[PDB]
Design a protein around this ligand. Structure first.
Ligand SMILES: [Zn+2]
Ligand SMILES: [Zn+2]
Lengths: 241, 320, 35, 48, 295, 66, 159, 149
């Protein structure tokens, strides 16, 4: 049955090569050919198929994802790290490659060098989900001052009132009440100080209600002086408290 | 944040009609005595610059003429068609004297060296070919773009060849090896037109993504001009720095070359008997006097604009 | 192709000279000084 | 489909009959990699 | 669809000293594209000349790109560093390179490495030069250094094999009687000698290299003290101490002139076994030929 | 490459027109859209040209404006 | 005088505190300390780079056979039994010729007894031996010299 | 004395590992590689009256023109020699293993002779150049109204 399996593999490989020569652009023949080689346990041949598919077209996300996934499912963990390094250095603007490489090298790898790589992506300045995931990975590595610096970098890169309120809440939860009050003061004086949205002022009033409520009454009075109905309700709550 | 200069705006003063096909390209005689339009009617029509009368019309390309250029130091016309052919014409006998054949697909653009006098032709087979003029031999074949090369610039400075293709990349080529040296992937969309400033050692690229100004020779990324974000088919720049960007929606956007400040946004009209879809600019070109702008519209018209000379800086303010 | 030995009759040596623009033909020497 | 599989089975039976009793310059897909593109390595890969 | 391998149009054939000959005053002939390569079939530059007097008028077989790949002679097809077959060198150092057997994939990969060498420096036996420096481990026990001219000796007169060479000594082919055709050493497939697969000369030299105990030693029953015979009083304890100082510390370095035994023993058992494998009829200490045995 | 002779006029003209359709349809696509459906756009264009040949009022109300 | 029992070197490769056997090779230690005080071997390229065997850097000639020493052109290769190129973290003088030792420092984290008889050993690198091994493990060309050149940033010749 | 396959780590001191050496693969250092966020960010607008923002003038342009013209004329003469129908040197070989004098002489190639080998070899093409790092602006994610738009 070995020669029959060889003849079947020759016929299937010939039909796969015929589909490739009919349509080199269609990557489904390449993907099914590589998974057929993986099912036939020709891992290096499937790696060659994935490499020629990337040579024909390196711009597909799913080719890198599939070849990294089969290298991770096999014993090619270092080869998967090579795949992720090439995918990052060719496509630094693809968020899923960053997320999946840091998840793989944080769960299977457990590498803080992957966190340094993800901080290199923080120097590529992503959206807020990636900054919050680096904050959460610093908390999972149990360094609250690191996550405070990451959130300060996020407030520097993408400044927002919600970002500064999250920084104040993170400094409050990281057992730094003075740093939380300083973050609330910097949110009042920096995050939309000319805008005067009276939301960072409300967060500073909540932080001063956590710390010492006379400062909460002063902050609510200052917000009602700077501002509407919400500021009037905050001043009335500070007067009734 | 510098305050931009005030280029004066422009006003339309003549419209030429008469083609039965789309006016694909506009070339001007370098002595500024006449101009010529290569159409999609496979017609190469010499028109008078002053009177606007039809001097001559020529046929011969079996498909659509994509490019027309007249040599600035030789009395020759180089017209590339979409029939995979380039015709060199002696205008003294007004005949096709030479034929350039060897592109496997339809030729979309051509350029000449101003001093070396060598031909480069970008075509639909994702390649350009560099031909000797007299012997009609492709001594080089530039390749590396995966999509069809929309435009080519041949300059005497470094690098000589600037190819803009539809695979969102710009290739900047070392000529003596025939090899690309710089590749720019920064445009999100197809690079359809590029324009060089004649003195500042810089250029710009128009795409449906944005406009991008760079600097020779490494292609250092100077500026990103947002706005006029349609399919920019053609580009030109004045000696003043008046940048005219013309897209396939028929709008002209006019800019300062230095600051990138859009000072004019003018949409032209169409032919009376025409669709609204027939408003698409195939070639915007200044004259040699840098005073008249020739736009090649998709309603088979040539719209030539004059400078809006009555404009002042307080009637037309520079924003920020 | 550096190796081909087939010669078409349109590939013959012909029109090997290049005429240039004279001063009656708007030479680039007078293009520069002319405005 | 089924007729092609029956023709392949009959060709296999003829192949065993000929083995019991050239390659025309083809590309042998099972014997080696049909085209080899090696994967790049960096900062890793002591392999297996 | 417009792909082909370019032609080996270059000078400087990289040849053995054996096929190069003995004359310093050499007259030379070069054909530009006279023949093709015997392996990758590119039209290559043929180099034909006469190294000596009794000659074949020897000439190059394979292309310069194939010779740059395999570091073998363009005529003799044996490795230039040692005079050995490439099967012997690949078994000695690294056999992970190989070559595809199908013609289309072979020509495509040959074009790929030809582009690689054309972008590279030009004088390099590709990637395994960095791993081929660790030599003279065992292959230099039988690697040639002499210029062998009996393989440069001309071909056999088949007319006098039939007994009918009327020219006699005027015939430049060899008027000696041939070798055994039943001998498998006479077969010598050129593609097999290139590929390093089942070359009978390579198998004969590997079978010969399996005979000498040049690094066996270890005749002492779990004892580091190995006695090197053939040493005498010429090899002292200081030579054994200087030899074992590179391997670590010498537990027992001594010379016994009664049995002509250099007693060498390192402190480590692995270092003592390495010193005994070096000195088992393969090392000379203080001008004395040492042969390791029980001590 | 072969010359575009008289027997090859309409086929090469329609081939270049289809290539122009592809180049002028790949470029207003924004980020996303897996179903590019350029074969469906070719079917729409072929039906439009056939209905103009047939003088049939061709309209697909589900079709983007540019 | 300048007879350093140890020398500290901070550069791009790292920080190495190599103890120099001034009791074993006194003339070589005096030449190395005076050359480190004068800045002769500082800033020069990594001359010799064997395959994780010997990394000699600091030669003014840049080849490993030259190098300007403070003992007068090339220093005397005065090897001693206490200072031999062996063990982990061995510091030596670049003496590729007989009685011609440069001021370049050679790091050998493995046994280098072939180079011990021909090169004067400065001393034993007790600290920075792993950094010296990581510097010396970088591969080079056929002349034991890679494309990358390793210079010296800061040096403390204490003693 | 008292003791007795990856890639090369390219650290430019303060910069922790240059990833441009991973961004180029077989490409040499002469080719410019835009691979960083510093490569991604634009320059500020500044004074156009600048020799940086000016041409390298007619002397360098004419020298480039002459050198390119000479190289292209060499290529044209090569193409004429390749398409148009129609000494005993004393060198030294160093075997490094003695050094020999070669009277390097070519042979008489016959014009009374057809072409030898078939040059119509149809093999598939080789791999291209290694790809550039795809620099772009951060993407604008389409809404679902944009997706059924
Ligand atoms: Zn030989
Ligand atoms: Zn070969």
């Amino acid at each position: 049955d070995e020669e029959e399996l060889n003849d079947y593999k020759l016929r299937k490989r010939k039909t796969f090569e015929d589909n490739i020569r009919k349509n080199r652009t269609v990557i489904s023949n390449w993907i099914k050919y590589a998974q057929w080689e993986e099912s036939l346990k020709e891992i290096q041949r499937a790696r060659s198929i994935y490499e020629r598919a990337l040579d024909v077209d390196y711009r597909n996300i799913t080719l890198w994802l599939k070849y990294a996934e089969m290298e991770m499912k096999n014993r090619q963990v270092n080869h998967a790290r090579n795949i992720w390094d090439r995918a990052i250095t060719t496509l630094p603007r693809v968020n899923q490659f960053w997320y999946k490489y840091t998840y793989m090298e944080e769960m299977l790898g457990n590498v803080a060098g992957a966190r340094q790589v993800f901080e290199r992506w923080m120097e590529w300045q992503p959206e807020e989900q990636a900054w919050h995931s680096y904050i959460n990975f610093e908390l999972r590595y149990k360094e609250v001052d690191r996550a405070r610096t990451i959130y300060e970098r996020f407030v520097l890169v993408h400044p927002d009132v919600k970002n500064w309120i999250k920084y104040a809440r993170f400094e409050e939860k990281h057992a730094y009440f003075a740093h939380a009050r300083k973050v609330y003061e910097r949110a009042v004086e920096f995050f939309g100080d000319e805008h005067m949205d009276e939301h960072l002022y409300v967060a500073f009033a909540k932080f001063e209600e956590n710390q010492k409520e006379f400062e909460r009454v002063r902050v609510i009075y200052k917000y009602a002086l700077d501002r509407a109905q919400e500021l009037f309700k905050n001043y009335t709550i500070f007067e009734k408290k | 944040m510098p305050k931009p200069q005030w280029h004066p705006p422009w006003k339309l003063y003549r419209v030429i009609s008469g083609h039965l096909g789309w006016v694909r390209c506009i070339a001007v005689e370098p002595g500024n005595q006449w101009f010529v339009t290569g159409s999609a009617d496979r017609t190469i029509k010499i028109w008078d610059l002053a009177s606007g009368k039809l001097k001559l019309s020529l046929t011969g390309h079996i498909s659509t003429v994509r490019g027309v250029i007249v040599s600035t130091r030789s009395p020759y016309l180089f017209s590339c068609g979409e029939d995979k052919q380039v015709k060199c014409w002696d205008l003294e006998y007004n005949k096709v004297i030479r034929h350039y054949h060897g592109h496997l697909s339809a030729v979309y653009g051509l350029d000449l060296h101003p001093t070396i006098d060598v031909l480069v032709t970008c075509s639909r087979d994702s390649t350009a070919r560099i031909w000797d003029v007299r012997t009609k031999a492709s001594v080089h074949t530039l390749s590396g773009h995966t999509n069809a090369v929309a435009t080519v610039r041949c300059q005497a400075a470094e690098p000589q060849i600037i190819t803009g293709s539809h695979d969102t990349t710009i290739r900047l080529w070392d000529l003596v090896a025939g090899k690309t040296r710089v590749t720019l992937t920064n445009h999100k969309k197809s690079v359809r037109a590029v324009v060089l400033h004649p003195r500042h050692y810089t250029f710009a690229s128009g795409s449906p993504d944005n406009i991008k100004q760079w600097k020779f020779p490494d292609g250092s990324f100077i500026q990103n001009l947002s706005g006029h974000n349609a399919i920019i088919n053609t580009l030109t720049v004045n000696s003043d720095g008046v940048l005219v960007s013309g897209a396939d929606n028929g709008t002209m956007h006019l800019w300062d070359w230095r600051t990138g400040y859009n000072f004019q946004r003018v949409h032209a009209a169409v032919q009376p008997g025409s669709l609204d879809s027939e408003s698409g600019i195939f070639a915007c070109a200044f004259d040699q006097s840098e005073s008249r702008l020739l736009t090649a519209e998709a309603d088979k018209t040539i719209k030539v604009y004059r400078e809006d000379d009555t404009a002042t800086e307080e009637t037309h303010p520079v924003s920020w | 192709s550096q190796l081909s030995k087939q010669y078409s009759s349109r590939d013959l040596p012909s029109h090997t000279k290049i005429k240039y623009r004279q001063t009656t033909q708007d030479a680039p020497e007078e293009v520069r000084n002319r405005d | 489909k089924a007729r092609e599989k029956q023709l392949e089975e009959a060709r296999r039976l003829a192949a065993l009959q000929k083995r019991r009793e050239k390659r025309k310059r083809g590309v042998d897909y099972n014997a080696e990699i049909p085209f080899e593109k090696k994967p790049a390595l960096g900062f890793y890969d002591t392999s297996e | 669809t417009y792909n082909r391998q370019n032609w080996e149009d270059a000078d400087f054939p990289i040849l053995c000293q054996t096929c190069l000959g003995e004359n310093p005053y050499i007259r030379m002939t070069k054909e530009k594209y006279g023949k093709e390569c015997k392996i990758c079939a590119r039209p290559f530059t043929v180099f034909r000349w006469c190294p000596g007097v009794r000659m074949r008028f020897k000439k190059t077989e394979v292309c310069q790109t194939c010779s740059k790949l395999k570091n073998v002679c363009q005529t003799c097809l044996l490795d230039l560093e040692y005079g050995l077959p490439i099967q012997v060198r690949d078994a000695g150092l690294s056999f992970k390179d190989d070559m595809p057997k199908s013609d289309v994939n072979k020509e495509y990969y040959t074009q790929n490495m030809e582009r690689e060498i054309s972008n590279s420096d030009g004088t390099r036996p590709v990637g395994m030069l960095g791993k081929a420096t660790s030599t003279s481990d065992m292959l230099l026990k039988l690697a040639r250094t002499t210029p062998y001219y009996k393989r440069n000796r001309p071909h056999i007169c088949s007319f006098w094999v039939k007994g009918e060479c009327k020219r006699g000594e005027e015939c430049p082919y060899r008027h000696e009687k041939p070798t055994d055709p039943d001998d498998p050493l006479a077969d010598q497939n050129i593609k097999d000698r290139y590929y390093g697969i089942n070359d009978p000369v390579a198998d004969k030299l590997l079978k010969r290299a399996s005979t000498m105990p040049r690094l066996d030693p270890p005749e002492d029953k779990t004892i580091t003290t190995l006695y090197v015979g053939g040493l005498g009083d010429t090899i002292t304890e200081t030579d054994l101490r200087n030899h074992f100082y590179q391997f670590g510390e010498i537990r027992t370095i001594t010379v016994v002139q009664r049995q002509q035994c250099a007693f060498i023993q390192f402190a480590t058992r692995q270092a003592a076994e390495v010193a005994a494998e070096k000195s088992f009829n393969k090392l000379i200490v203080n001008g004395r030929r040492l042969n390791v045995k029980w001590g | 490459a072969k010359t575009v002779t008289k027997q090859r006029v309409e086929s090469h003209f329609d081939l270049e027109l289809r290539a122009a359709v592809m180049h002028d349809i790949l470029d207003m696509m924004p980020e996303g859209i897996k179903q590019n459906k350029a074969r469906t756009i070719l079917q729409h264009l072929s039906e439009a040209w056939r209905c103009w040949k047939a003088n049939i009022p061709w309209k697909v109300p589900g079709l983007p404006t540019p | 005088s300048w007879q350093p029992p140890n020398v500290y070197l901070e550069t791009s490769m790292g920080i190495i505190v190599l103890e120099l056997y001034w009791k074993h090779a006194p003339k070589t230690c005096k030449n190395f300390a005076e050359l480190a005080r004068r800045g002769y071997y500082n800033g020069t390229k990594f001359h010799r780079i064997i395959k994780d065997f010997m990394i000699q850097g600091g030669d003014p000639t840049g080849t490993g056979r030259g190098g300007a020493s403070i003992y007068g052109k090339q220093f005397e290769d005065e090897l001693h039994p206490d200072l031999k190129f062996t063990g982990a973290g061995i510091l030596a003088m670049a003496n590729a010729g007989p009685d011609t030792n440069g001021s370049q420092f050679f790091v050998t984290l493995a046994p280098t007894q072939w180079l011990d008889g021909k090169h004067t050993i400065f001393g034993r690198v007790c600290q920075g031996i792993g950094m010296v091994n990581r510097v010396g493990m970088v591969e080079t060309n056929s002349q034991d010299r890679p494309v990358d050149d390793v210079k010296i940033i800061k040096a403390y010749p204490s003693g | 004395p008292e003791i007795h396959n990856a890639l090369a780590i390219q650290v430019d001191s303060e910069g922790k590992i240059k990833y441009d050496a991973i961004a180029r693969q077989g490409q040499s250092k002469d080719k410019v590689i835009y691979s960083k966020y510093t490569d991604l960010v634009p320059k500020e607008v500044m004074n156009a009256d600048d020799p940086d923002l000016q041409r390298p003038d007619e002397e360098a342009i004419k020298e480039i023109t002459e050198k390119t013209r000479v190289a292209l004329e060499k290529s044209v003469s090569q193409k004429v020699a390749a398409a148009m129908p129609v000494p005993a040197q004393y060198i030294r070989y160093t075997p490094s293993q003695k050094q020999r004098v070669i009277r390097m002489v070519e042979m008489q190639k016959d014009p009374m002779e057809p072409p030898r080998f078939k040059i119509n070899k149809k093999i598939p093409r080789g791999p291209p150049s290694p790809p550039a790092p795809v620099m772009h602006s951060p993407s604008r994610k389409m809404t679902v109204k944009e997706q059924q738009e």
